[PDB]
Design an enzyme around this catalytic site. Structure first.
Site, short mmCIF file in Angstrom:
data_model
loop_
_atom_site.label_atom_id
_atom_site.label_comp_id
_atom_site.label_asym_id
_atom_site.label_seq_id
_atom_site.Cartn_x
_atom_site.Cartn_y
_atom_site.Cartn_z
N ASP A 119 0.83 -1.21 0.00
CA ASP A 119 0.00 0.00 0.00
C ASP A 119 0.86 1.26 0.00
O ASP A 119 0.53 2.24 -0.65
CB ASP A 119 -0.97 0.01 1.19
CG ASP A 119 -2.26 -0.74 0.89
OD1 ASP A 119 -2.27 -1.57 -0.04
OD2 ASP A 119 -3.27 -0.48 1.59
N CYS A 176 -2.32 0.00 -13.67
CA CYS A 176 -2.43 -0.01 -12.21
C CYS A 176 -3.68 0.82 -11.94
O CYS A 176 -4.68 0.62 -12.61
CB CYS A 176 -1.17 0.52 -11.53
SG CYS A 176 -0.40 2.02 -12.29
N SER A 177 -3.66 1.74 -10.98
CA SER A 177 -4.85 2.58 -10.83
C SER A 177 -4.87 3.73 -11.85
O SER A 177 -5.84 3.88 -12.59
CB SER A 177 -4.98 3.13 -9.40
OG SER A 177 -6.26 3.72 -9.23
N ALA A 178 -3.80 4.53 -11.90
CA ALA A 178 -3.70 5.64 -12.85
C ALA A 178 -3.00 5.24 -14.16
O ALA A 178 -3.13 5.92 -15.18
CB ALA A 178 -2.96 6.82 -12.21
N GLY A 179 -2.26 4.13 -14.15
CA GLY A 179 -1.53 3.70 -15.35
C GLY A 179 -0.22 4.45 -15.62
O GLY A 179 0.20 4.58 -16.78
N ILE A 180 0.44 4.93 -14.57
CA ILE A 180 1.71 5.64 -14.74
C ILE A 180 2.84 5.24 -13.77
O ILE A 180 4.00 5.25 -14.16
CB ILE A 180 1.55 7.20 -14.74
CG1 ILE A 180 0.90 7.70 -13.44
CG2 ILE A 180 0.71 7.64 -15.90
CD1 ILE A 180 0.63 9.24 -13.44
N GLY A 181 2.51 4.91 -12.53
CA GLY A 181 3.55 4.66 -11.53
C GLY A 181 4.11 3.25 -11.58
O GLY A 181 5.20 3.00 -12.13
N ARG A 182 3.36 2.32 -11.01
CA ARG A 182 3.70 0.90 -11.11
C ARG A 182 3.80 0.45 -12.56
O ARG A 182 4.70 -0.29 -12.94
CB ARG A 182 2.66 0.06 -10.36
CG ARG A 182 2.81 0.22 -8.86
CD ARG A 182 1.56 0.79 -8.26
NE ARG A 182 0.95 -0.19 -7.40
CZ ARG A 182 -0.32 -0.17 -7.02
NH1 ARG A 182 -1.16 0.78 -7.42
NH2 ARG A 182 -0.76 -1.14 -6.24
N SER A 183 2.84 0.88 -13.37
CA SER A 183 2.86 0.54 -14.79
C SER A 183 4.15 1.04 -15.45
O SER A 183 4.73 0.34 -16.30
CB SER A 183 1.65 1.14 -15.51
OG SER A 183 0.43 0.54 -15.07
N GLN A 200 6.18 7.58 -10.47
CA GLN A 200 5.52 8.63 -9.67
C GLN A 200 6.27 9.11 -8.43
O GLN A 200 5.90 10.13 -7.85
CB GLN A 200 4.13 8.18 -9.24
CG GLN A 200 3.10 8.19 -10.37
CD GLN A 200 1.68 8.21 -9.84
OE1 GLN A 200 1.07 7.17 -9.60
NE2 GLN A 200 1.16 9.42 -9.64
#
Length: 299
Positions: A181, A215-222, A262
């Site tokens: 998290d 992922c949620s926004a499609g930028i960090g983990r992705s 991010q």
């Protein structure tokens, strides 16, 4: 490795925050006019995360062709990726239309449906074989065929049917379930073990459409997933750990979608993953079995 040299000296001088800010400052800025149209307000999960017009994926629709998704096309590495937000309750039909039209073989999911007590993604695939999903708007049918659950990721086999022509295809769903998290999983072993599972499946092959990553926004983990994969592929192509510059690769990727990676911590983890993964690329085949054990996927 010039990469590992830079790593230990950024760590030494404790300057990840500053290195990461330099990236943000230099990153491309392109228009996102379509994303910002009033008719599309409810197709965006986050007001501050939008696809650029030049690289957005267009739905093959007469009415509204918009979805919050970007084609990352990496010229030298000869690999493409589609990065997208976690689907919303009203965009699940659009999501699967995209997968069909782009001829994707795999979908990579890096978040959980609920995180930090709120909903980060719609339930866009079926949880039980006997309860298939129909998306009326896009006329597609989706069935769970099988599920293989490991300790930190789950692989699903799905069948997607175009109800219009009755053609069917097998889609593989790779779900990383253990990103913490807060703050990056700071051993890369399980991350790398997961990436290599996706590679082995054939989902990243040039013979298929681009893999879909979210992922949620499609930028960090992705962003982390795609950056690590592309760097490793480049090192493989010239078998030269030294020529690959992670920051330059990330800036190239940011030409196609904003905000990839991010946090400073996510950048540091990306370095770690590439450095450890390089061992395998350069001939130590045995390192892959080590990751698989280090990431106790049976618990």
């Amino acid at each position: 490795m010039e990469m590992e040299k830079e790593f230990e000296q950024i760590d030494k001088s404790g300057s990840w925050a500053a290195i990461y800010q330099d990236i943000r400052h230099e990153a491309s800025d392109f228009p996102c006019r379509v994303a910002k149209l009033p008719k599309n307000k409810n197709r965006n999960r986050y007001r501050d995360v939008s696809p650029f017009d030049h690289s957005r994926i267009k739905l093959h629709q007469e009415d509204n062709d918009y979805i919050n998704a970007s084609l990352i096309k990496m010229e030298e590495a000869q690999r493409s990726y589609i990065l997208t937000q976690g689907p919303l309750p009203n965009t699940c039909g659009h999501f699967w239309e995209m997968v069909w039209e782009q001829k994707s073989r795999g979908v990579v999911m890096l978040n959980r449906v609920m995180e930090k007590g709120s909903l980060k993604c719609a339930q866009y695939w079926p949880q039980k074989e006997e309860k298939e999903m129909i998306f009326e708007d896009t006329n597609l049918k989706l069935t769970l065929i099988s599920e293989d659950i490991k300790s930190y990721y789950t692989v699903r086999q799905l069948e997607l049917e175009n109800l219009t022509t009755q053609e069917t295809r097998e889609i593989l769903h790779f779900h990383y379930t253990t990103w913490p998290d807060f703050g990056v999983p700071e051993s890369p072993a399980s991350f790398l073990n997961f990436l290599f599972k996706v590679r082995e499946s054939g989902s990243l092959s040039p013979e298929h459409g681009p893999v879909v990553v979210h992922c949620s926004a499609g930028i960090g983990r992705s962003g982390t997933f795609c950056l690590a994969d592309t760097c490793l592929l480049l090192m493989d192509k010239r078998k030269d750990p030294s020529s690959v510059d992670i920051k330059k690769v990330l800036l190239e990727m940011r030409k196609f979608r904003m905000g990839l990676i991010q946090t400073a911590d996510q950048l540091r983890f990306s370095y770690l993953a590439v450095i450890e993964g390089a061992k395998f690329i350069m001939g130590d085949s045995s390192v892959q079995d080590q990751w698989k054990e280090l990431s106790h996927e049976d618990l």
